[PDB]
Structure 1
Amino acid sequence: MEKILIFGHQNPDTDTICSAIAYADLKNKLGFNAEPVRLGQVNGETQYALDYFKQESPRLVETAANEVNGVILVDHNERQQSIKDIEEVQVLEVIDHHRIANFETAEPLYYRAEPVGCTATILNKMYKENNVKIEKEIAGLMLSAIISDSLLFKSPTCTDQDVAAAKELAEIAGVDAEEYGLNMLKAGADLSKKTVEELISLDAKEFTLGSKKVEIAQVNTVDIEDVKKRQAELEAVISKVVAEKNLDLFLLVITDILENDSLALAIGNEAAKVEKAFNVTLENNTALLKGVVSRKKQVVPVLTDAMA
């Protein structure tokens, strides 16, 4: 039975890891042959989820074509967010909830995107459509992904489907969603053991907006001040990436998970487009983005219009 790899994006975050694992489990329980893999380091928020439900980290890979002919993408589609040799394998399926860009197939495929809060909310539907029982631990991972991408049901991308799925999965997982969730989020906001290199890359995503190359990284915190004090070190690693990747903008979004506001740190030739996008004034490369917690909904589209 032909082997496939399932993976999320570069710089893996909780949905990318947990949805890879969940979808491979769904494929395997249906008699197929799938391995969840990951494309980079597991962050602390995902580590808490993996440790709590006693699941191993997916195997790390840099390429797929040496292993398989066919892959499934979860939690992304854009080539530059994907495995470095994506053009050498066939994308059989994509399960996702982001905008579509920089993605092309030679052939028809199963492409399933729904504008909900995360991939795990779609996978929950798919288990039910396929009459496959969700194990306790898988449900905990899928619940973990929903909490992560909704910031405990606070993000404006959180839909009623996400809430309903979290309720089902918390019950299957045997945990109280708010208690577990707070602890998971706090574990990823523990920025004490983290270098600035880790801070700008743990949850970083590349995009092309119009003709401009951008990178938007996100970090969660309970105190924006404790990130802000590392600004000079942050601008040093950021401007190094800006040069290396020829970016027009690197935007770091430092998210206060208590207040649901973010401090932006914008470096690059197009930094002023951030002022236009958010109606905000950059002072010493930063500005408070009030209520802004979601990259796909509150950053990407307004930045696209601004840079156009």
Structure 2
Amino acid sequence: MEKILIFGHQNPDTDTICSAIAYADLKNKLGFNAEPVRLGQVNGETQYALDYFKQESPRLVETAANEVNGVILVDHNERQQSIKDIEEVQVLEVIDHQRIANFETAEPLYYRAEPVGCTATILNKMYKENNVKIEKEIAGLMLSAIISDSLLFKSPTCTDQDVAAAKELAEIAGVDAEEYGLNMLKAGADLSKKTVEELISLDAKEFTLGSKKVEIAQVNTVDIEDVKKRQAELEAVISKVVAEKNLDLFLLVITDILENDSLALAIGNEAAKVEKAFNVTLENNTALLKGVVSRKKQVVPVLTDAMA
């Protein structure tokens, strides 16, 4: 049976790790040959989930073409967020919930994206469509993904489908989703032993907005001041990235997960576009984004319109 690799985006989050694991499980339970893998380091939030449900981290890879011919993408599509040698392999399927850009195939494929709050919400449907029992631990990881992406059902990307899936997955996993999820989210918001290099990369994604090359990085925190007091050090590593990668904009989005508000730190030639996007005045490279917590819903589309 031909082996495939299943993985999500660089700088993996809980949905990208757990959805890779769950989809590989669903493929293997159906008699196929899948290995879930990851493209970077496991963050504290994901590690809490993996540890709680006694699951291993997926194997770390840098490339796929040395290993297999065919891959499945979960939780992303854009080339520049994917494995570095993505053009050397065939993308067989994509299960996702981001916007689509920078994605092309030579041949028809199974592309399944729904505008829902979490990729694992789609995978939940797929288990059922295929009449495969979701094991307790798998359900736990899928629930983790949903709580992560929805910030415990508070993010505006969260839909009724995500809430229903989480309800099913929590009963199967044997946990209280509120209690568990609060602890899980807090594990990811622990910024104590985090360097600024880590802060600006742990949840970084690159985009091309029109002709403009952009990186948007997000940080979950229980206290914006703890991050903001590192501003000079953050500006230094972000500046290095802006130069190195020839970005028109690096936007760091520092999210208060308790208040659902974010502080923007914008660096690069196109910083003033953030002002247009959000109707704010940047003062010393920062501004308050009231209510903004979702990159896919509240940052990418308005920043696209502003940049163009």
Q: What's the TM-score once normalised by structure 2's chain length?
A: 1.00
Identical positions, percent: 100
Question: Deviation string for 1:116-151 (max 9, x for gaps)?
Answer: 001000000000000000000000000000000000
1:30-59 Cα offsets, whole Å, 9 max, x none, are 000000000001111111111111100000
What CA distance in whole angstroms lies between the structure 2 residues aligned with 1:129 and 1:193? 43
* In structure 2, distance between residues paired with 1:197 and 1:54: 29
Deviation at 1:68, TM superposition (A): 0.1
Secondary structure, counterpart of 1:207 in structure 2: strand
Residue 211 of structure 1: how far off its partner (Å): 0.4
Unaligned residue ranges in structure 2 (runs of 5+): none
SS in 1 for 2:127: helix
Superposed CA offset, 1:171-226 (max 9, x none): 00000000000001000000001100000000000000000000000110000000
Q: Using the alignment, how far apart are the partners of 1:215 and 1:59 within structure 2?
A: 26
| Distance in 1 (alpha carbons) for counterparts of 2:82 and 2:90 | 13
- Per-residue CA deviations over 1:37-91 (Å, capped at 9, x if unaligned) read 0000111111111111110000000000000000000000000000000000000
- C-alpha displacement at 1:103, in angstroms? 0.2
**2-side partners of 1:101 and 1:255: how far apart?**
25
Instruction: Give the distance between the partners of 2:57 and 2:137, measured in 1 at CA.
Output: 13
The alignment partner of 2:73 has SS state of strand
Q: Residues 1-21 of structure 1, C-alpha deviation per residue, up to 9 Å, x if partnerless? A: 000000000000010000000
For residues 143 and 213 of structure 1, the distance between their equivalents in structure 2, rounded to whole angstroms, comes to 34
Following superposition, which runs of at least 4 residues in structure 1 exceed 6 angstroms of deviation?
none
Q: CA deviation at 1:99?
A: 0.4
CA distance in 2, matches of 1:293, 1:207: 18
Secondary structure of the corresponding residue to residue 220 of structure 1: strand
* 1:35-46 correspondence to structure 2 within 5 Å: 35-46=35-46
SS in structure 2 at match of 1:201: coil
C-alpha separation in 2, matches of 1:118 and 1:100: 15
Secondary structure at 2:205 match in 1: strand
Counterpart-to-counterpart distance in 1, 2:284 and 2:49? 36
Match of 2:139 in 1: 139
Distance 2:219 2:150 in 1: 14
CA deviations 1:232-283 (Å, max 9, x no partner) are 1100100000000000000000000000000000000000000000000101
Aligned to 1:259: 259
In 1, the alpha carbon distance for the partners of 2:53 and 2:253 equals 29
Distance 1:243 1:133 in 2: 49
> 1:22: how far off?
0.3
Query: What SS does structure 1 have at the residue aligned with 2:200?
Result: helix
Deviation of 1:297 (Å): 0.3
Q: Which residue of 1 aligns with 2:188?
A: 188
* Aligned-residue RMSD, C-alpha: 0.4
Q: Identify unmatched segments of 5+ residues in structure 1.
A: none
Structure 2 equivalent of residue 280 of structure 1: 280
